[PDB]
Amino acid sequence: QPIFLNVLEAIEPGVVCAGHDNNQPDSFAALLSSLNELGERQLVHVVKWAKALPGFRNLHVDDQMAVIQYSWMGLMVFAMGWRSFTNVNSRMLYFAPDLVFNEYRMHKSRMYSQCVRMRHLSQEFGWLQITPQEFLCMKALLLFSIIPVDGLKNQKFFDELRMNYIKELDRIIACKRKNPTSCSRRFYQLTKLLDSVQPIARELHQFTFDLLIKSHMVSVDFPEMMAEIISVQVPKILSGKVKPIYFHT
């Protein structure tokens, strides 16, 4: 019974515009300010999405706020790469309908290398032929893939919720294969695909953090929440107090 996939397909966030005025010359300040808006806006959907995930509400209230604040980067990035694959075919980074990056914008944003890694991540969806169901499960798993070293208020329930989503992932895979090797290798690819999101997210955390500090020097504006999160939560990740949960080592 696909009750679970039912829920994931139903609660999946629709399209979100960054409000970018594609009339303005692609400058550093304009591009990043629009991505910050996109992030702020897209953050709102992430919150509604999560609170709609099976079992998410049961987690403690504080932990609910923490897991979102720690894993939002990786979530938005993962989804972004999906939009780029299914759309612009991965040639470019489909951030929002009104904010699609090309080679030029990648350079002007002062984060060309990171964009390359994201484009590659985007390409992986093709190489691995990730079906839409696999995408959803993996994305859900990402919310539960980064936590504080000290632990959550109720780690007990977190470990169990995480464990379940993983089962769901396996369940998804083993619904077309028959071989003992087939389902096994597929799981290996995905768990790796998932791990690879972490290093990318970590570069953007660093990047946005530095950008925030010298935000007034470069005329880049950070919305209310985006500024608050990058200065309180992100620093815990960069300082190692919050760390991703990797499948492999």
């Binding site: 953050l43 919150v47 706020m65 929440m225």
Partner: peptide, 4 residues
């Protein structure tokens, strides 16, 4: 909170 504010957005939760």
């Amino acid at each position: 909170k504010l957005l939760f």
